Design an enzyme around this catalytic site. Structure first.
Site, PDB file in Angstrom:
ATOM      1  CG  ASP A 178      -0.193  -0.097   2.519  1.00 26.48           C
ATOM      2  OD1 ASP A 178      -0.865  -0.401   3.533  1.00 26.48           O
ATOM      3  OD2 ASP A 178       1.044   0.129   2.571  1.00 26.48           O
ATOM      4  NE  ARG A 231      -0.418   3.259   4.583  1.00 32.75           N
ATOM      5  CZ  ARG A 231      -1.555   2.570   4.554  1.00 32.75           C
ATOM      6  NH1 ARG A 231      -2.362   2.530   3.499  1.00 32.75           N
ATOM      7  NH2 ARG A 231      -1.951   1.871   5.613  1.00 32.75           N
ATOM      8  CG  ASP A 280      -4.265  -0.449   7.394  1.00 35.78           C
ATOM      9  OD1 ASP A 280      -3.582   0.454   6.868  1.00 35.78           O
ATOM     10  OD2 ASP A 280      -4.756  -0.348   8.538  1.00 35.78           O
ATOM     11  CB  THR A 281      -1.664  -4.433   2.142  1.00 38.45           C
ATOM     12  OG1 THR A 281      -0.542  -3.535   2.310  1.00 38.45           O
ATOM     13  CG2 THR A 281      -2.490  -3.876   1.010  1.00 38.45           C
ATOM     14  CD  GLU A 292       4.186  -2.554   7.396  1.00 41.29           C
ATOM     15  OE1 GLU A 292       3.017  -2.192   7.134  1.00 41.29           O
ATOM     16  OE2 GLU A 292       4.970  -1.878   8.101  1.00 41.29           O
ATOM     17  NE  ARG A 300       3.360   7.051   4.618  1.00 39.88           N
ATOM     18  CZ  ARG A 300       2.929   5.894   5.096  1.00 39.88           C
ATOM     19  NH1 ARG A 300       3.249   4.742   4.501  1.00 39.88           N
ATOM     20  NH2 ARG A 300       2.177   5.918   6.171  1.00 39.88           N
TER      21      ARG A 300
END
EC number: 3.1.31.1
Length: 135
Positions: A15, A29, A34-35, A37, A81
């Site tokens: 992401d 971002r 949320d993916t 990590e 970001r």
């Protein structure tokens, strides 16, 4: 919200992606998702992280056109970001990850929440199909 063109520099993980935006390198971002990590010791390589990462990478590297869409709120986070929806050939990667069970919808911060409902719809479908993290 309007779409603006950008060019791929490097996908970093599921992401976070580095793009050339209005002439400059910039780290983006993905908004609202949320993916798992691939880095961070607080974690490590979590399950489905390599998968989320390769999926974002491939969609971006095989695209004809990449576009970034900022939302109505702040456009950068505290790390500098860009906060955006990213499109590959017209398909939103943030939704594509969620529809695949490769990302969860994130905690939402108004007013950066324009595609919240839509994403939530795709997440419920992925849950129902028991895809990937929902398996």
């Amino acid at each position: 919200l309007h779409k603006e063109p950008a060019t791929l520099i490097k996908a970093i993980d599921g992401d976070t992606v580095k793009l050339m935006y209005k002439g400059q390198p910039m780290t983006f971002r993905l908004l609202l998702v949320d993916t798992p990590e691939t880095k961070h010791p607080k974690k490590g390589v979590e399950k489905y992280g390599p998968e989320a990462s390769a999926f974002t990478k491939k969609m971006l590297e095989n695209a004809k056109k990449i576009e970034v869409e900022f939302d109505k709120g702040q456009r950068t986070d505290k790390y500098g970001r860009g906060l955006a929806y990213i499109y590959a050939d017209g398909k939103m990667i943030n939704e594509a990850l969620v529809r695949q069970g490769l990302a969860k919808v994130a905690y939402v911060y108004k007013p950066n929440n324009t595609h919240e409902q839509h994403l939530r719809k795709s997440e419920a479908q992925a849950k129902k199909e028991k895809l990937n993290i929902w398996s």
